[PDB]
């Protein structure tokens, strides 16, 4: 019955809680168990880490992340349970049931019952820990779904030698609070503190970066003579602390974004390394400064457009943010979303502001803008521009309209 | 080494899968337990036909009594009852019939080693002869506006079956007699039983005494365990007694307290450690705070400086708004304005960063996921699969409009922020308008 | 005896046997129904109306202990909560029993809550406490 | 508040202004404005000015009176002794009428014995 416990840092309470509720005897484990925590909390890490120290526990792993809807989730349970039972106890003569025949939860219960009856010849009652990771991460999800897996194993015959012991992992708190009356054993994961995130990153992603090809070049290029592994470890470790203290207020406390920033900035930081840069990381900071001054998560005269298109996009912004009351006076709410307008207004304002009549090039540029999605419409499928019901709005921010006005020498700044 | 025997015995009694000879019935339940048992024995032993619905909230021990009665009767009448189980959540209005058909055959196999379906079931029973037992959880689901043909047939079979027939229903609604249609309501025997609620602290103390005591000499420390349990339940100033009183005052579902206690017994490594833990009773506080760790305060304590400042600025805009709505542009404008004010109140020297609008996007994304914000009319998690289908078919405007102009509403009002945010925070002075 | 069990309703006695937090919830909801003349109250109203009802009597000594129970569960290691202990538990339990009606909205403050039972029997249940 | 504090002592014809003058002055302002009957977030007037919370307070007070009576090593105690032991021992002093009400309820339920005004005695 006794289960050994791995020493997972910053999850000691939860590791003790998983030492509870999980044991060989199915009479000492509950029918359902939920571990909850937002993304980047270590639940998928900790659960696997605990199962990897006690092989005798028969665990089945599935991920609703891959399994788009509930039908794959049902079918995978039967498939993987059957395969695992064959892998563990092969000598018993059994007959296969097609996992694609599981079209309903009742059929899942039927198939599980049949499989356990086929294994009835077992001497001892044993557990079967079916594991689902990120139940609420399922994309085709509704509230009523989870009760079906809460109240499942009581429809199984309790005489069976194999007992299913569900384990769930969840992200949101608004999902748990609809099921608090069931008193299901719950283990909680809070977001890590900064002191925890920094140490987790140092422990995890240090050696992997320490021996990358980029340094394999630079060490020989700089002809480092007295280098040892400890110096490598310290130099690599300083990078994580610098990035964390630089971008903590930007990323927050998430491991993933910090890892991505480290991945992007590590070759560039390594590039600045010289003979005099190591053993004085302060100089390394004082030379790679511009890496720590911009996030560099950006994917890369920003718009090069025809003059007619530029003035059309000026007039459309005027239409989208000027109240209709002023069209008869001025020409004769920035923070809010743009209002809708009609093409009749756009053409008139464009004619009134261009330094043109109705040649086809104007309409061609307008349709180009729509195809460029610099101007939006009130529809999603089967675009029917010529239908009178469609209305138009601007999909471009002010910061670009200002530059367009500068490039065409226009004075939108004086109309508001 | 021997401590493990008693430590496992305690857990095995706690989970409740005890042998019928060792099982426990709490005192306040016994009246309804006997009311149920009399009907069950009348239907099985004396071949009566009856239909009963049990009432009470979830985790009210409602099905535990039925399980105990069936486990008792299996000892003396093993060959004289057939049990049919149906659950409202798993079985739809279609899959119930197939479940009945499969379970009947499954029971018959180990026994021997809808206009006509029910009649043919009765004829097969007659030709093979045994009392048929029906158990329903979530009666209200079967008693919805969807046609109630299943229960309509089951309650009709009560006074017409040539084979003894018994039906038990389980649900938490109190308006069951209005859930059932007038046609079905007429046919039902209407012997409604409401589960007895814990209504005194003496009831809960006695329930704990019944649940945690050991009635046999499994371990030499059983006598010490029972004595210590009674001592802690006796002294009003015991930490365990205080926690039990708090539980009774707050919520009166006993299985919640059971599940709270389970980790304390499970974690115990030695008898001395068990005694010290149960006397101090401090680990329930740790359990309770972990139950609260992902609440609003717990999430708010984990945010960064810039995240907190942007949250405060968003809250200020929500407060000033007539409807509480706000967007990214207004939030960044207020963030810039407050940074300018903070810089201005710092005197200039004779001869704090405003983060770029692009960098603030990650902070906004972080806060939208942690549910501090919410979209203007976000329904959130839909209730049923059909609603999810119609929701996934439709395309909401809030998912199409730019990142800078999506309308949001606030979950933590500025007053709550001023309650929670430490005064040592630099941005605390802006928790007021 | 058969006629009595057909006529009598368990609603009132079940309410009188509810835990303290549920009775406090119903009392605060009735108080808001009186002070506003409305049928439904947002959780944004009720969560702080309970705080108001605790604070009005706050001059009493045992109000400190009941506040410690409701907002920190009687432990020093737990900080202030924006909900009373088991707010979710009792909120669901009243919905589970059919006493209460709640409208779907993923915002924990603008969500509206309405009684399903009649007002007079709720008043009677509150009077018997 | 200060002007009313001086005005009260002038009625008292006393050379100084003291706590009773200040507290009465504070109360008079409270009663004049009708503060406690006014909602603190809407400014509306409560036209009603025993709640369940009051019922709980009296329940716990009676139970604590029983606990103090049965826990002390004396079969009987005076109400002043009880006040010194509990009411004035911790937190600001509460009005003794509530203690008297609780012990009177217990006596009516025959849980405590009140032989006289000066003494309170345990159960028979
Ligand atoms: N205590 C820890 N020590 C070291 N690394 C940890 C620890 N906890 C979490 N991690 C790291 O967290 C990373 C992310 O995995 P994690 O288990 O946190 O995901 P998750 O929260 O389950 O994700 P999702 O919701 O997307 O499924 C892992 O790669 C792991 O290295
Ligand atoms: N076979 C069993 N062995 C031990 N305990 C059981 C068993 N079945 C139920 N219980 C106990 O029942 C308690 C919860 O009540 P129960 O299971 O009777 O309600 P329910 O049928 O789920 O209720 P409802 O249908 O009203 O939601 C738990 O504490 C659990 O320990």
Curated annotation (Swiss-Prot), chain A:
A single MF term (Gene Ontology): ATP binding
Record's subcellular location: Nucleus
Keywords annotated in UniProt: ATP-binding, DNA replication, Nucleotide-binding, Nucleus
GO biological process: DNA replication initiation; pre-replicative complex assembly involved in nuclear cell cycle DNA replication; regulation of DNA replication; silent mating-type cassette heterochromatin formation
UniProt cross-references to Pfam families, sorted A to Z: AAA_16 (PF13191), ORC5_C (PF14630), ORC5_lid (PF21639)
Binding site for ATP: 37-44
GO cellular component terms given for this protein: Cul8-RING ubiquitin ligase complex; DNA replication preinitiation complex; nuclear origin of replication recognition complex; nuclear pre-replicative complex; nucleoplasm; nucleus
KW ATP-binding (keyword) present: yes
Subunit note: Component of the origin recognition complex (ORC) composed of at least ORC1, ORC2, ORC3, ORC4, ORC5 and ORC6. Interacts with ORC6. Component of a cullin-RING ligase (CRL)-like complex composed of at least the cullin RTT101, a linker protein MMS1, and the potential substrate receptor ORC5. Interacts with RTT101 and MMS1.
Additional remarks: Present with 768 molecules/cell in log phase SD medium.
Similarity annotation: Belongs to the ORC5 family.
PANTHER family in alphabetical order: ORIGIN RECOGNITION COMPLEX SUBUNIT 5 (PTHR12705:SF0)
Protein name stated in the entry: Origin recognition complex subunit 5
Upper taxonomic lineage: Eukaryota, Fungi, Dikarya, Ascomycota, Saccharomycotina
Swiss-Prot record, chain B:
Family: Belongs to the ORC4 family.
Domain of life: Eukaryota
InterPro entries: ORC4, ORC4_C, P-loop_NTPase
Function as written in the Swiss-Prot or TrEMBL entry: Component of the origin recognition complex (ORC) that binds origins of replication. It has a role in both chromosomal replication and mating type transcriptional silencing. Binds to the ARS consensus sequence (ACS) of origins of replication.
Record protein name field: Origin recognition complex subunit 4
Pfam families named in the record: ORC4_C
GO molecular function (one): DNA replication origin binding
Alphabetic keyword roster: DNA replication, DNA-binding, Nucleus, Phosphoprotein
Lineage per the UniProt record: Eukaryota, Fungi, Dikarya, Ascomycota, Saccharomycotina
UniProt KW Phosphoprotein keyword: yes
Subcellular location: Nucleus
One BP annotation, GO: silent mating-type cassette heterochromatin formation
GO cellular component, one term: DNA replication preinitiation complex
Subunit structure: Component of the origin recognition complex (ORC) composed of at least ORC1, ORC2, ORC3, ORC4, ORC5 and ORC6.
Further facts: Present with 2170 molecules/cell in log phase SD medium.
Provenance organism: Saccharomyces cerevisiae (strain ATCC 204508 / S288c) (Baker's yeast)
UniProtKB/Swiss-Prot annotation, chain C:
Protein name: Origin recognition complex subunit 1
Gene: ORC1
Part of the whole protein covered: 780 to 908 of 914
Protein function: Component of the origin recognition complex (ORC) that binds origins of replication. It has a role in both chromosomal replication and mating type transcriptional silencing. Binds to the ARS consensus sequence (ACS) of origins of replication.
Organism (species): Saccharomyces cerevisiae (strain ATCC 204508 / S288c) (Baker's yeast)
Misc. comment: Present with 3930 molecules/cell in log phase SD medium.
Domain notes from UniProt: The N-terminus is dedicated to mating-type repression.
Subcellular location: Nucleus
Protein family membership: Belongs to the ORC1 family.
Known partners and oligomeric status: Component of the origin recognition complex (ORC) composed of at least ORC1, ORC2, ORC3, ORC4, ORC5 and ORC6. Interacts with MCM10 and TAH11.
Curated annotation (Swiss-Prot), chain D:
Location of the protein in the cell: Nucleus
Additional facts recorded: Present with 8800 molecules/cell in log phase SD medium. Early fractionation of eukaryotic MCM proteins yielded a variety of dimeric, trimeric and tetrameric complexes with unclear biological significance. Specifically a MCM467 subcomplex is shown to have in vitro helicase activity which is inhibited by the MCM2 subunit. The MCM2-7 hexamer is the proposed physiological active complex.
Subunit structure: Component of the MCM2-7 complex. The complex forms a toroidal hexameric ring with the proposed subunit order MCM2-MCM6-MCM4-MCM7-MCM3-MCM5; loaded onto DNA, forms a head-head double hexamer.
Family listed: Belongs to the MCM family.
Stated role: Acts as a component of the MCM2-7 complex (MCM complex) which is the putative replicative helicase essential for 'once per cell cycle' DNA replication initiation and elongation in eukaryotic cells. The active ATPase sites in the MCM2-7 ring are formed through the interaction surfaces of two neighboring subunits such that a critical structure of a conserved arginine finger motif is provided in trans relative to the ATP-binding site of the Walker A box of the adjacent subunit. The six ATPase active sites, however, are likely to contribute differentially to the complex helicase activity.
Record-given protein name: DNA replication licensing factor MCM4
């Amino acid at each position: 019955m006794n289960v050994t416990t791995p020493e997972v840092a910053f999850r000691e309470y939860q590791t003790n809680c998983l030492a509870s509720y999980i044991s060989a005897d199915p009479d000492i484990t509950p029918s359902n168990l939920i571990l909850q925590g937002y993304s980047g909390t270590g639940k998928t890490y900790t659960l696997k880490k605990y199962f990897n120290a006690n092989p005798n526990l028969h665990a089945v792993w599935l991920e609703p992340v891959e399994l788009v809807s509930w039908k794959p989730l049902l079918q995978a349970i039967a498939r993987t349970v059957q395969y695992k039972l064959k892998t563990l106890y092969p000598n018993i003569p059994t007959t296969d049931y097609d996992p694609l025949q599981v079209e309903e939860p009742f059929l899942l219960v039927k198939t599980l019952h049949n499989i356990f009856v086929q294994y009835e010849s077992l001497q001892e009652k044993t557990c079967l820990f079916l594991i689902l990771d990120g139940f609420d991460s399922l994309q085709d999800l509704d509230a009523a779904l989870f009760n079906k897996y809460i109240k499942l194993n009581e429809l199984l015959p309790k005489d069976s030698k194999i007992n299913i012991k569900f384990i769930y992992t969840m992200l949101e708190t608004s999902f748990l609070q609809r099921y608090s009356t069931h008193c299901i054993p719950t283990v909680m994961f809070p977001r890590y503190n900064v002191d925890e995130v920094s140490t987790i990153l140092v422990m995890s992603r240090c050696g992997e970066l320490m021996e990358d090809s980029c340094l394999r070049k630079r060490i020989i290029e700089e002809q480092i003579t007295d280098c040892t592994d400890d110096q490598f470890q310290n130099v690599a470790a300083n990078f994580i602390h610098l990035i964390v203290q630089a971008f903590h207020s930007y990323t927050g406390n998430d491991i993933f974004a910090l890892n991505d920033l480290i991945d992007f900035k590590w070759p560039k930081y390594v590039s600045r390394i010289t003979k005099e840069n190591i053993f004085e990381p302060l100089a390394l900071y004082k030379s790679a400064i511009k890496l720590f001054l911009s996030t560099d998560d950006n994917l890369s005269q920003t718009y090069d457009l025809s003059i007619i298109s530029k003035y059309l996009l000026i007039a459309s912004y005027i239409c989208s943010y000027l109240e209709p009351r002023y069209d008869a006076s001025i020409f004769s709410p920035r923070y809010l979303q743009p209002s809708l307008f009609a093409i009749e207004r756009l053409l008139a304002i464009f004619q009134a502001i261009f330094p043109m009549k109705a040649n086809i090039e104007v309409f061609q540029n307008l349709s180009e803008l729509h195809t460029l999605k610099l101007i939006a419409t009130t529809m999603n499928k089967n675009i029917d521009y010529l239908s009178p019901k469609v209305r138009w709005k601007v999909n471009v921010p002010w910061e670009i309209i200002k530059e367009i006005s500068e490039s065409v020498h226009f004075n939108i700044s004086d109309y508001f | 080494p021997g401590f493990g025997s008693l430590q496992r015995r305690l857990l095995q009694q706690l989970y409740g899968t005890l042998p019928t000879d060792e099982k426990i019935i709490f005192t306040y339940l016994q009246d309804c337990q006997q009311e149920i048992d009399r009907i069950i024995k009348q239907s099985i032993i004396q071949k009566e036909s009856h239909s009963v619905i049990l009432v009470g909230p979830r985790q009210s021990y409602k099905t535990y009594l039925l399980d105990y009665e069936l486990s008792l009767l299996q000892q003396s009448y093993k060959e004289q009852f057939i049990t049919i189980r149906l659950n409202g959540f798993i079985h739809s209005e279609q899959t119930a019939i197939n479940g009945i058909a499969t379970q009947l055959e499954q029971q018959l196999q180990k026994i021997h080693g809808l206009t006509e379906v029910f009649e043919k079931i009765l004829l097969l029973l007659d030709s093979t002869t045994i009392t048929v037992v029906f158990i329903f959880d979530e009666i209200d689901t079967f008693a919805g506006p969807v046609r109630q043909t299943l229960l309509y047939n089951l309650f009709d079979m009560v006074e017409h079956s040539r084979v003894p027939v018994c039906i038990f229903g389980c649900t938490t609604k109190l308006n069951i007699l209005e859930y059932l249609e007038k046609r079905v309501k007429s046919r039902f025997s209407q012997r409604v039983i409401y589960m007895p609620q814990i209504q005194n602290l003496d009831d809960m103390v006695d329930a704990v005494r019944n649940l945690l005591t050991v009635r046999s000499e499994i371990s030499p420390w059983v006598s010490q365990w029972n004595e210590t349990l009674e001592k802690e339940l006796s002294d009003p100033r015991s930490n365990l007694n205080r926690h039990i009183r708090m539980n009774f005052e707050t919520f009166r579902s006993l299985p919640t307290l059971k599940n709270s206690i389970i980790p304390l017994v499970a974690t115990s490594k030695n008898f001395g450690s068990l005694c010290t833990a149960i006397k101090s009773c401090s680990f329930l506080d740790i359990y309770n705070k972990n139950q609260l760790s992902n609440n609003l305060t717990g999430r708010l304590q984990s945010l960064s400086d810039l995240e907190l400042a942007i949250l405060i600025s968003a809250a200020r805009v929500a407060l000033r708004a007539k409807d509480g709505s706000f967007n990214f542009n207004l939030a960044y404008a207020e963030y810039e304005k407050m940074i300018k004010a903070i810089n201005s109140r710092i005197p200039t020297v004779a001869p704090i960063k405003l983060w770029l609008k692009k960098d603030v996007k990650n902070v906004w994304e972080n806060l939208v996921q942690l549910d501090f914000f919410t979209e203007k009319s976000a329904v959130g998690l839909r209730d049923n699969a059909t609603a999810a289908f119609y929701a996934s078919n439709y395309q909401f405007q809030g998912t199409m409009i730019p990142f800078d102009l999506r309308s949001y509403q606030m979950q933590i009002i500025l007053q709550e922020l001023r309650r929670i945010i430490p005064k040592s925070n630099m941005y605390y002075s802006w928790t007021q308008l | 005896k058969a006629l009595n069990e057909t006529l009598n309703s368990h609603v009132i006695t079940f309410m009188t046997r509810l835990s303290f937090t549920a009775k406090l919830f119903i009392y605060a909801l009735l108080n808001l129904m009186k002070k506003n003349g409305s049928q439904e109250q947002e959780l944004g109203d009720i969560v702080d109306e309970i705080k108001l009802l605790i604070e009005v009597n706050g001059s009493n000594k045992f109000v400190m202990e009941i506040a410690k129970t409701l907002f920190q569960q009687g432990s020093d290691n737990i900080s202030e909560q924006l909900r009373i202990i088991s707010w979710d538990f009792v909120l669901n339990q009243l919905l589970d029993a059919g006493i209460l009606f709640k409208q779907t909205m993923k915002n924990d403050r603008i969500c509206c809550v309405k009684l399903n039972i009649s007002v007079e029997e709720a008043k009677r249940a509150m009077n018997e406490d | 508040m200060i002007r009313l504090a001086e005005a009260h002592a002038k009625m008292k014809l006393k050379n100084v202004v003291e706590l009773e003058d200040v507290q009465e002055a504070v109360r008079l302002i409270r009663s004049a404005i009708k503060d406690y009957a006014t909602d603190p977030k809407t400014g509306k007037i409560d036209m009603n000015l025993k709640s369940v919370i009051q019922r709980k307070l009296q329940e716990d007070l009676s139970r604590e009176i029983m606990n103090v009576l049965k826990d002390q090593a004396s079969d009987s105690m005076s109400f002043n002794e009880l006040i010194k032991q509990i009411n004035e021992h911790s937190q600001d002093r509460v009005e003794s009428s509530d203690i008297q009400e609780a012990l009177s309820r217990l006596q009516q339920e025959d849980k405590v014995i009140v032989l006289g005004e000066g003494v309170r005695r345990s159960v028979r």
